[PDB]
Structure formats: C-alpha cells, structure tokens
Amino acid sequence: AYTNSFTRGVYYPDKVFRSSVLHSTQDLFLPFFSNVTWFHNPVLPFNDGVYFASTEKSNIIRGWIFGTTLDSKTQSLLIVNNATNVVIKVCEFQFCNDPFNNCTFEYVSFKNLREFVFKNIDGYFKIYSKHTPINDLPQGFSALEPLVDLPIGINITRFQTLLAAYYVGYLQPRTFLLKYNENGTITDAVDCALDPLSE
C-alpha cells in the first residue's frame, strides 16, 4: 500500500539558535509529498534514514531491531520498551524470525503520534523525535527535537520492527529553506527543488 506524507518530517539539523531569520540548509530530509509505506512486522532496508511514524492507542508498537546480517557473527543494535525503561544494547542476541553475547555497549533508563527519525551518520546512531496528540496521516507541520545519541560505529544496512498503524519514509539529500520564528522554533519550510515556484 501507499500514502502521501504532506508536510511532515523536518528536524532541527544542528544546535544553534536563530531568531526570525530564514535559513537555507542542505542535509538528509524527507522529500515533500513523498510516499510512505503504510503498514499494519517484516524487515526493511535502511537506505540512508527512516521516518518511522505511528498513530497508536495503547503502545502496541514497542521497539526496533537493527543490524547488517540481523543475527550472530555481526553486531546488531536493539531498542525496547518493556514497560520499565528503554533498554538499549549492541549485543548479538539470536534474532528470532518472529520476535515480539559478547557485546560492547549497554544502557537502561487514535491520539498519539510518535514521529521519529533515525540516522547512522559516521556509523554512530542519531535520533530525533516529537510526540504529538492527534484525533490516515494528518496534514500539518511540526519540527523534530533531538533527544538521544549513541557512539557505536556499528555497520547498519537493514532493520526491522517489533510489536494500530505505522509508516516508513526514506531520507534523501535535499536542500530546504527553514523559517525560524522569534523564539527559534521552526515554523515553516520550503522544499528547494519540488517545483518552479519553490525554486
């Protein structure tokens, strides 16, 4: 299946603060009016990023799975919310073909829209997020504030999903034009290559 992500998927590309100034930045962004592979379980590729979204009711979507060969003999990340905290590992736990050991990291800590973004820039993990109430992907604009960072340097090519609806995009290297308001909040953006008026 397919659907059309109208205007979503803009994340603060850096840490500076700019007030009421139009800036033009080039990075990996989700192209405007793209297709998102509407879903309702299997593995997927990790071309250069993701735009995992969701519209859940009771936290049916839990976590994720990453990694190149997705089992032993090559490392593979993990993220889970097992009703306690977001346990993170880079271990080689045998990846069951239907899920729901010598490792070098660890960590332990429709009305929702858990928009997320994932990037393996320089092989290390980078996560953004924005958790918005809603009441079938709505239009509207909202930026993404970074919340985590993992210095792993693992080699990722593929990922998966654990267990409402969720979607998937793919980031691409496109130039935008961001409208910081006075508070420094991204308020609007223009895709710099969509069509002649935008150019």
Partner: protein
C-alpha cells in the same frame, strides 16, 4: 604465601590496564580543565567546543532547552549557553578603531588633540562626543562656522593663552 617470608616470595597484586583504540568516539577520557567565570573584560574564551575572544556579559535571550549557540544574520557567533550554570551570555568584540592626529597649522602652533574613533575611552580635558571621544580640547557652548570638521556635527578650531576648542 607466608607473611614472614622475604619480599622475594611475598605476594603482590598486579593490575594490567590494556589501552585499546579503534575507530570509536572514545568516551573513556579524563576530566577537562575548568576556570572560573569573568565578565566585562576582553578575555580569550574557549567554551565547551568553540573558542574566540570577546567581552562576555549577562544576556536576556531565551534559548530552546536543547540549543547551545547563537548566530547573526551573517553567521557569526553571538551567544553561548554556559555549560556549568545554564545562563546565556553574549559576546561583544572588544573595541578597536583608528587614531587621528588633529593639528592646526604647524606654522601656528605645536599643540594637537587626538580623537579615538568609536570608543567609550573609560578603559582606553577628556571629552566624550558622538563620533569618538576627543582628548585635549576645551568644550564651548557657543557656535561658529565649521573650521575643522570632525563628524556628526562637531567642528573644532583653535582659539584663545590659546587652546583648541570643540
């Protein structure tokens, strides 16, 4: 192992730290230096990542809870969030400018008066004007035709024993 041997057979504990390095962010690192904070002086700073020289002053900008820097329309550093106590500072380049030697005719006199351009000369008889601050010139409340123009409506001239007036 007996406590009353010599040192030769006497037990010793050994720990061997094997420092290994790969293409990793290398988080296992020792404490960095941290000096106390001084404001209102042209100091040579190095905040968490970035460096430079300026005159740090307490500010009133409101960063977002995750931002750290600030920038102008021309992409220049302007504000820094202090990593220890989260108060936002500003950054002003400590002043510079030019030196200009006013003279009447050397034929007339050897006395001059200097004008430092665009400073407050409180850290640089002594007069503060709108174009700089003038050193070595009386102030009159009268008005005449312009003799030696200076800027922003100030003209100085040599007048009566005599001296230089502005």
């Amino acid at each position: 192992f007996q406590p009353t041997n010599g040192v030769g057979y006497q037990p010793y504990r050994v720990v061997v730290l094997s420092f290994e390095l790969l293409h990793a962010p290398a988080t296992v690192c020792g404490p960095k230096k941290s000096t106390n904070l001084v404001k209102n002086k042209c100091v040579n700073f190095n905040f968490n990542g970035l460096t430079g020289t300026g005159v740090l002053t307490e500010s009133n900008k409101k960063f977002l809870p995750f931002q750290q820097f600030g920038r102008d329309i021309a992409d220049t550093t302007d504000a820094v969030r202090d990593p220890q106590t989260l108060e936002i500072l500003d950054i002003t380049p400590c002043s510079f400018g030019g030196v200009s030697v006013i003279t009447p005719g050397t034929n007339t006199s050897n006395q001059v008066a200097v004008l430092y351009q665009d400073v407050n000369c409180t850290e640089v008889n002594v007069f503060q004007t709108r174009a700089g601050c003038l050193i070595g010139a009386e102030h009159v409340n009268n008005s005449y035709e312009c003799d030696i123009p200076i800027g922003a409506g100030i003209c100085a001239s040599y007048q009566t024993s005599q001296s230089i007036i502005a």
